[PDB]
Structure formats: C-alpha cells, structure tokens
Amino acid sequence: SMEQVAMELRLTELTRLLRSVLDQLQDKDPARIFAQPVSLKEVPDYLDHIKHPMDFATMRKRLEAQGYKNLHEFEEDFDLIIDNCMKYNARDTVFYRAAVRLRDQGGVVLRQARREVDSIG
C-alpha cells in the first residue's frame, strides 16, 4: 500500500535525524567510555548488577535496522547508558563523572531533537 510506504518514509527520515542525534551525543564522550558494550570477559559480574546493558555501538546497530519507532525509544537507550554507569561505578570515578558530563551535554541536544521531531512530524 501507498500508506505503508509513506509510514516507511517517515521512519527513514526519523532514522536520519536520530543518526545525527547519535553522532552529536557520542561526540560528548571523547574518552570513548560508552562506545562499546561493557566486556563480560573483563567485568564478569556485570550482569549481576546491570540488567539491561547499553552502549553506543549497540544503539547504532538498532538504529541502522530502523529499530527506533520514535524518539522516546532512542532516549530510553541513551538513558540506560548513563544510568547503568552511575549505578555500577562510584561517584569518585572517571566512569561516573563521564556519565554525568554526557547526561548534561546530551540534554541540550535532545531538547532540540524533540522540537524537530514534533515540528517536522
């Protein structure tokens, strides 16, 4: 149907905007602390602590399969990255501090992304 195509084009365009958002958020992590999944070889107890691990590579795989239907879904995964790190790691660590800075800087980006998603529809 033509309706299904139109919906698919809307999803494609959301995926474009989310790719640009993802790039901008990841630039706020110049240490690359959040680039890849926490290694279960190197942190063997991780899943005892964190039930839904997340990282930028995993988000990018989902994105490229057009697996985010709306910005809320994408924000949920971003927040997991931050929130997981702020639980596993203590306040005095480079990891926790990196997460706080990512959260604070990403807020700016996400605020305008929400306006753009609503605005363009």
CATH class: Mainly Alpha
Question: What proportion of the residues is helical, as a percent range?
Answer: 55-70%
Q: In the CATH hierarchy, what is the superfamily? A: Bromodomain-like
Note the gap between the termini: 21 Å
Oligomer: monomer
Count of individual beta strands: 0
Strand content: under 5%
Q: How many strands, which pairing sense, and closed or not: the largest β-sheet? A: none
| CATH architecture field | Up-down Bundle
Q: How many alpha or pi helices?
A: 5
Going by helix content, strand content and strand pairing, the class is mainly alpha
Shape: globular
Description:
This protein is mainly alpha-helical. The protein has one domain (1-121): Bromodomain-like (Histone Acetyltransferase, Chain A, Up-down Bundle), CATH 1.20.920.10. The chain has helices at 2-27, 46-49, 56-64, 71-88, 94-120. Helix 1 (2-27) packs antiparallel against helix 3 (56-64). The longest helix has 27 residues, at 94-120. The chain starts with a helix and ends with a helix.
